[PDB]
Design a protein around this nucleic acid. Structure first.
Ligand SMILES: [Mg+2]
Ligand SMILES: [Mg+2]
Ligand SMILES: [Mg+2]
Lengths: 79, 175, 81, 114
RNA sequence: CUGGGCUACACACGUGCUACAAUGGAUAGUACAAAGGGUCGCGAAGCCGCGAGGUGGAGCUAAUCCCAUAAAACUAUUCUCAGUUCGGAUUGUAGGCUGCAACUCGCCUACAUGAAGCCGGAAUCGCUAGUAAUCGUGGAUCAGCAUGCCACGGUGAAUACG
RNA sequence: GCGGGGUGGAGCAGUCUGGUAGCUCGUCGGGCUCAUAACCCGAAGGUCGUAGGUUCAAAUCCUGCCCCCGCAAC
C-alpha cells in the first residue's frame, strides 16, 4: 500500500444485534462506537443487523408458513 | 487474521486428509480475490466512475484501478481507450478480511439469500459470483447510492479442480 | 351474499361437486350458474361455466376461492376496436 | 423523522396523514394511544414522545409493506385471469362502472381522435 | 325456460352533479321551515355497534303517532392562503342492507390510497323579484337501486340608458 | 450513360456552414350557420428514399444500392 491514496481502514468489531454475535475484521467505518473486546486492544464497533450466525439458510428456515391463502380465511369466516 | 488462523488450524489438515495429497504444498489456497464493477455507462457520463470508484474503495479498503477498453466497439458506442469500470485485487490480510465481512455480514443481507450457485466454476478451479447491488455491503450507505450496479467477485484458487475448490470454499463458509 | 348469514352456492352445483369427489377429474361439470360462490371443495375439478353462448372452462384454485364463477367467464368479447 | 421526513411545521395529525397508510382518524387513535396533545406542532415534539409514536406506528402496518400487499393482491387476480383483473391489466374501471363516457382517471388523459 | 345484452369503449356532442377554496374547510354547541307519505305500511323510546345498520316493539288506518336532528345562518376553537386538513376520483381489504341471488351489474359504511383540477379557447345559456343564485326537505316510480323529475319552504340580490 | 432531385397528403425550403424540423395549401376535431363553403379556435401528421460509415450527435459530411423527371443511347 501507498501513503495517502487508500482510505482509512482499521480493525473493527461487528456485532449481530439479533443475537450479539461478536466478530473482528477490518473495515473503514466506526458506527460511532468503541469497545475493548479481546483484551489488549481497542476496536471500533460496527454494529449490524442479521449475520451468518442467525441467517435462516445457515440455520433453521421452515418459519413463516402462516396461511394457505383465502381458504382458511373463507372457512374461518363462515365456519 | 481470524480466517487465516482458522485456515492453517483446521482446514488444511482436514482438506489434505480428505483429498489425500502427497505433500503439504499440494493443498489448495486462495491466491487472491478480484472485485470488478464492469461499468459501461461511463461512455455518456463521468459522474458514474466518480461514484463507483469511491464506492469500491469504501467496500474494499484500497483504491481501484479504472480499466480501459482494449478495442473499439460501435455496438456499445465504445471507443478504445475509454475508461470502463474499475477493479481491485485483494490479497493476504485484506482478502481474508473481505471474505470474513462477506459471509458474516453482507451475503445474508441479500433479498432472498439461499446461498449461491455451486455450478459457477470456470472449470480450472476458480469461482466467480456477482453482487447484484453494492448496497449489500455495510461500509456504504444506501442514501449515497444514486443508482445501483453490481460487481463480479472472483475468488481465485491454487486448486486444480472444481471439487477441491468447492471443499475449500465450503470449509471457509461459502454456501 | 355479502353478509355473515351466507355463503351462497347453488344446490344443483354443490350436489354435483360433492358427487365429484370420486370424479377423478377426467370428467367436467357444466353449469349455467355464474352467481354461485366458489368453495374450496370446488378445487381441482374444472367447471364449464355458461357465459351466454358457450360453456367456457375454468380451473379452480385456492386463489380463486371466495369469488364467483362468472368472474372467470367473461360475457362481452372485445378486441380493442 | 417518523418513517419519512414529515413536515416540521405541520401539526402531528396532519404530519402522520402524510404517511402512505395513515390518515386523520388513525392519527387521532395513535396520538390517543400516546396520550399526547394532537393540536401540538411537530418541531415542538419531544424525543421519547416521538419514540413511543414510532412504536405504535411499527405496530401498525409498514408503509412499503402496504405497497407490497396491495400490489400482491392486484397481481393475484391479474395472474389468474378473472374479469376484474383483466380490467386491472387493460387499465379500465373495475367496479361496475360505465366506459362509454367519463372514464378518465383509468383510461388516462384524452387519447388521440379515432 | 335458463343464462347473457340494453351498463360494452379508441373517440365527439348535449344536459347536469361535484369542485378548483379563506364570504372557506375540520370539530363542537345550537335557533328558525313549508309542502308531503304511511297497514301490513310508518316505525318511536331504550339498547349493541366507530359507522352503514342490528335489536326492540310504543303509538298510528293518522291536525293525535311516525318518516323527521332540516340544512344553509349564528356562536366558539383550529387550519393561515399552501395542490393545502382544498378536492374527492380510482383502487385494496373488511362490513351492512335488499332481495333465491349484488361477477357481468345495486346502494350505503369503515380504514387506507389519494387522481384530475389553483376559475376555464373560439363560442354559448337562464334570469326583471321573493326572481336569479344557494341550501336542505318531501313525493312518485320502487324489495333495493337518482347528481334525474315534480312540488316544498329557508336566505336573498344586481340591472334595465335605450 | 449525363444532369436534377427523393423531407407529414401536394408543392417548396432547410444541406454548401453537423445540434435548429420550417412556408403556403390541405387533413382531423370544436365552434358560426337550417346544412356545405368561407371565417374563428385548438390538434395531429414527417426518424428526411434505403443500407452502411464518420462524429458526442447527421435531413445535413462520405460510400453503395433503389426509385422519379428531363437529356442522350437504343
Ligand atoms: Mg339505455
Ligand atoms: Mg324594457
Ligand atoms: Mg438534426
Amino acid at each position: 500500500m501507498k501513503t495517502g491514496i487508500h482510505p482509512e481502514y482499521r480493525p473493527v468489531v461487528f456485532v449481530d444485534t439479533s443475537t450479539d454475535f461478536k466478530f473482528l475484521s477490518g473495515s473503514t467505518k466506526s458506527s460511532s462506537e468503541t469497545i475493548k473486546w479481546e483484551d489488549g486492544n481497542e476496536y471500533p464497533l460496527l454494529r449490524v443487523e442479521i449475520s451468518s450466525d442467525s441467517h435462516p439458510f445457515y440455520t433453521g428456515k421452515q418459519k413463516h408458513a402462516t396461511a394457505d391463502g383465502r381458504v382458511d380465511r373463507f372457512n374461518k369466516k363462515y365456519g | 487474521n481470524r480466517l487465516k488462523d482458522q485456515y492453517l488450524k483446521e482446514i488444511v489438515p482436514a482438506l489434505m486428509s480428505k483429498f489425500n495429497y502427497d505433500s503439504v504444498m499440494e493443498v489448495p489456497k486462495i491466491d487472491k480475490i478480484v472485485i470488478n464493477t464492469g461499468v459501461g455507462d461511463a461512455t455518456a457520463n463521468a459522474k458514474v466512475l466518480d461514484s463507483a470508484v469511491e464506492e469500491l474503495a469504501l467496500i474494499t479498503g484500497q483504491k481501484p484501478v479504472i480499466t480501459k477498453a482494449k478495442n473499439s466497439i460501435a455496438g456499445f458506442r465504445l471507443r478504445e481507450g475509454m475508461p470502463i469500470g474499475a477493479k481491485v485485487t485483494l490479497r493476504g490480510e485484506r482478502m481474508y478480511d473481505f471474505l470474513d465481512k462477506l459471509v458474516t455480514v453482507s451475503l445474508p443481507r441479500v433479498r432472498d439469500f439461499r446461498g449461491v450457485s455451486k455450478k459457477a466454476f470456470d472449470g480450472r478451479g476458480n469461482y466467480t459470483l456477482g453482487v447484484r447491488e453494492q448496497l449489500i455491503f455495510p461500509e456504504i450507505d444506501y442514501d449515497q447510492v444514486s443508482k445501483v450496479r453490481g460487481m463480479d467477485v472472483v475468488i481465485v484458487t491454487t486448486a486444480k479442480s472444481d471439487e477441491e475448490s468447492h471443499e475449500l470454499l465450503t470449509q471457509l463458509g461459502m454456501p | 351474499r355479502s353478509l355473515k348469514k351466507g355463503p351462497f352456492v347453488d344446490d344443483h352445483l354443490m350436489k354435483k361437486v360433492e358427487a365429484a369427489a370420486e370424479s377423478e377429474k377426467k370428467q367436467v361439470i357444466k353449469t349455467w350458474s355464474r352467481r354461485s360462490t366458489i368453495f374450496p371443495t370446488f378445487v381441482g375439478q374444472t367447471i364449464a361455466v355458461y357465459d351466454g353462448r358457450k360453456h367456457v372452462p375454468v380451473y379452480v384454485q385456492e386463489d380463486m376461492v371466495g369469488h364467483k364463477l362468472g368472474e372467470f367467464a367473461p360475457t362481452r368479447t372485445y378486441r380493442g376496436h | 423523522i417518523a418513517g419519512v421526513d414529515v413536515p416540521r411545521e405541520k401539526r402531528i395529525v396532519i404530519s402522520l396523514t402524510y404517511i402512505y397508510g395513515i390518515g386523520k382518524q388513525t392519527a387521532k387513535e395513535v396520538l390517543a394511544e400516546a396520550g399526547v396533545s394532537e393540536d401540538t406542532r411537530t418541531r415542538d415534539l419531544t424525543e421519547e414522545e416521538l419514540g413511543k409514536i414510532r412504536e405504535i406506528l411499527d405496530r401498525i402496518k409498514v408503509e412499503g409493506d402496504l405497497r407490497r400487499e396491495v400490489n400482491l393482491n392486484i397481481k393475484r387476480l391479474i395472474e389468474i385471469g378473472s374479469y376484474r383483473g383483466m380490467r386491472h391489466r387493460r387499465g379500465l374501471p373495475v367496479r361496475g362502472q360505465n366506459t362509454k363516457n367519463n372514464a378518465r382517471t383509468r383510461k388516462g388523459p384524452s387519447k388521440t381522435v379515432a
